[PDB]
């Protein structure tokens, strides 16, 4: 039929002289005959005019050979969290000189940021199209009266777009090489992007080699997130419309079903935050996908080897110390033993029992409410398997969500998405889950064979420590373990263990 894109919102009651008209449909009926237009010199062209043009109605379906597609699949959105940034814009209505289109007023991001803009819009004139201030008003309702003060204050689009580039740059420069705007109803937000997004074939950053994420109109050049300073436009963005996945009611509804922290003020950024929150829940709270792998953005390899070295020492030692008959490995989707050479019966449990070797894992979602009396025999292992209250007979490792890093991103409730290798949604650290446990003190244990300045320590439990044996081999191994242990402590991980754990059970293997 006819589109809404570029709707002339002007209160003018005539047409646009065949010469000043941009389209056939915009020409005044006074020059239209038998399907064509005709130059009637007695009806002269307009010397001057100003017609507000609606920029609502963009459709970005293009499939052009060298150009990236702005909208992405749910798969890519997940593949590239980090890059996710929530985006919601509150507008205002065109009103005196024109009417029938919305202008950006408050731009909200899933950072805490709210940028207020001068209501500007696109005006077609007799010579060119001008980008200028447009008369506007906040939407009619009562819940929109908070936008009345914002019709004053605010600032120039000159600025607002630089601020956006800067804001995104700071947020994303150590996380991704792109940006993915996370949208609820993409219409108006895509319109707002016209005001600060340019697109084209992929490019790379001046100086750097990374992907260009920004563009300077000032001097036709491109930038990554680390060099984009003074750059005014976002260059190739990506975006995802969350509601299009398949949702019931409004944003407020679906979000609050899965979250009690992000309170909704009527302000733009809250809707942005909530939008992201919801998307995270539908991809990361809906349990872990181990086939999706994420790249190293920094110092992950050192944390992971520390985590395993410690995991091994602690579980190895507790099994020798208290001679448990059974080890209940809760939270292991694979069939991998952290102490593969132990005599104990090793049972595996998980909510996502990997299909490839499904037979070795009992499907289970642990709840204290349910299983508090079920795993009585032996010891339970919860190494980054975050539950409700933990059972007294347990060895536990839990990530403190409050620790900031490039790996720890915001998530549901009060928790977070720890994205090391693979993405792990971790529920907020709750002190009372460890009621039944003891915080695990530092120790080192080795029953291995033995071999500028040496050190003595009481925490080194080794056959060569009964008074002077800095045993060069196990001096090193101790000092390395010590570093690994401290790595993971300061990396945010917390260790707890059954109260009966006693290092004399370990010393006793040597006092004999």
């Amino acid at each position: 039929n006819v589109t809404g894109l570029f709707k002339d919102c002007s209160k003018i009651i005539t047409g646009l002289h065949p010469t000043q008209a941009p389209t056939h449909l915009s020409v005044d009926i006074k020059f239209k005959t038998e399907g064509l237009c005709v130059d009637i010199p007695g009806i002269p062209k307009d010397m001057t005019y100003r017609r507000l043009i609606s920029m609502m109605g963009f459709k970005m379906n293009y499939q052009v050979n060298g150009y990236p597609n702005m909208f992405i699949t749910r798969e890519e959105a997940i593949r590239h969290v980090r890059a996710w940034i929530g985006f919601d814009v509150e507008g205002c209505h065109a009103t005196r000189d024109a009417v029938g289109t919305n202008l950006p007023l408050q731009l909200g991001f899933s950072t805490g940021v709210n940028l207020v803009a001068v209501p500007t819009g696109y005006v077609d004139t007799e010579n060119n199209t001008e980008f200028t201030r447009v008369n506007a008003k906040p939407p009619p309702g009562d819940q929109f009266k908070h936008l009345i003060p914002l019709m004053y204050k605010g600032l120039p689009w000159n600025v607002v777009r630089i601020k956006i580039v800067q804001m995104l740059s700071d947020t994303l420069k150590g996380l991704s090489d792109r940006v993915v705007f996370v949208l609820w109803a993409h219409g108006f937000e895509l319109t707002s992007m016209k005001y600060f997004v340019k697109i084209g074939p992929e490019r790379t950053c001046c100086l750097c080699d990374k992907r260009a994420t920004c563009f300077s109109t000032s001097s036709d050049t491109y930038a990554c997130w680390n060099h984009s300073v003074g750059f005014d436009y976002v260059y190739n963005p990506f975006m995802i419309d969350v509601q299009q996945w398949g949702f019931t009611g409004n944003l407020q509804s679906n979000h609050d079903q899965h979250c009690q922290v992000h309170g909704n003020a009527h302000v733009a950024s809250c809707d942005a935050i909530m939008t992201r929150c919801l998307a995270v829940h539908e991809c990361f709270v809906k349990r872990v996908d181990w086939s999706v792998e994420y790249p190293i953005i920094g110092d992950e390899l050192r944390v992971n080897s520390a985590c395993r070295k410690v995991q091994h020492m602690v579980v190895k030692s507790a099994l020798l110390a208290d001679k448990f008959p059974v080890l209940h490995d809760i939270g292991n989707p694979k069939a991998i033993k952290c102490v593969p050479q132990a005599e104990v019966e090793w049972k595996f449990y998980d909510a996502q029992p990997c299909s490839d070797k499904a037979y070795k894992i009992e499907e289970l979602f642990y709840s204290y409410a349910i299983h508090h009396d079920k795993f009585t025999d032996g010891v339970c292992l919860f190494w980054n398997c975050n539950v409700d209250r933990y059972p007294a007979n347990a060895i536990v490792c839990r990530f403190d969500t409050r620790v900031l890093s490039n790996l720890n991103l915001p998530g549901c409730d009060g928790g977070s998405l720890y994205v090391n290798k693979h993405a792990f949604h971790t529920p907020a650290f709750d002190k009372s889950a460890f009621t039944n446990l003891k915080q695990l003190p530092f120790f080192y244990y080795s029953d291995s064979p033995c071999e500028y300045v040496p050190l003595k320590s009481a925490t080194c439990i080794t056959r060569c420590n009964l008074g002077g044996a800095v045993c060069r081999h196990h001096a090193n191994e101790y000092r390395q373990y010590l570093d690994a242990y401290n790595m993971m402590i300061s990396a945010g991980f917390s260790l707890w263990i059954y109260k009966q754990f006693d290092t004399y059970n370990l010393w006793n293997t040597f006092t004999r």
């Binding site: 006819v2 589109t3 002339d8 005959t33 052009v64 340019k198």
Partner: protein, 132 residues
């Protein structure tokens, strides 16, 4: 909602792409090479077809060989409601009529991007120039 509309869902995609592009000219050309259909809904003139061959004229001046169009509608930058590359920035085709070879009048907008006007005779180089 008010307003008196402007465009046809045909141009809706083509235009969104060039509006957002860094280089609209390049974008449009690439778009067409990628199989997209050229911008339509232009201002085509009912004309005697007896006028001077000149490209940019005050009133319609088509030949039997040409068609006459309402200049602004043949200008990519006017159709996208974006900035013009004229450093001063006033469109050279708005408020005038544009003469386009019937053989090339399939794509008015592209035709004006792709071609150039002779400063001496006022006719398109290659499409009606008597110099050289």
């Amino acid at each position: 909602h008010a307003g008196n509309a402007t465009e046809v869902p045909a141009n809706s995609t083509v235009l969104s792409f060039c509006a957002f592009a860094v280089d609209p000219a390049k974008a449009y050309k690439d778009y067409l090479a990628s199989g997209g259909q050229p911008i339509t809904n232009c201002v085509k003139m009912l004309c005697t077809h007896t006028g001077t061959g000149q490209a940019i004229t005050v009133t319609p001046e088509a030949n039997m060989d040409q068609e006459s169009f309402g200049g602004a509608s043949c200008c990519l930058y006017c159709r996208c409601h974006i900035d013009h590359p004229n450093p001063k920035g006033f469109c050279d085709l708005k408020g005038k009529y544009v003469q386009i070879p019937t053989t090339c009048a399939n794509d008015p907008v592209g035709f004006t991007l792709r071609n150039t006007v002779c400063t001496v005779c006022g006719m398109w180089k290659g499409y009606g120039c008597s110099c050289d």
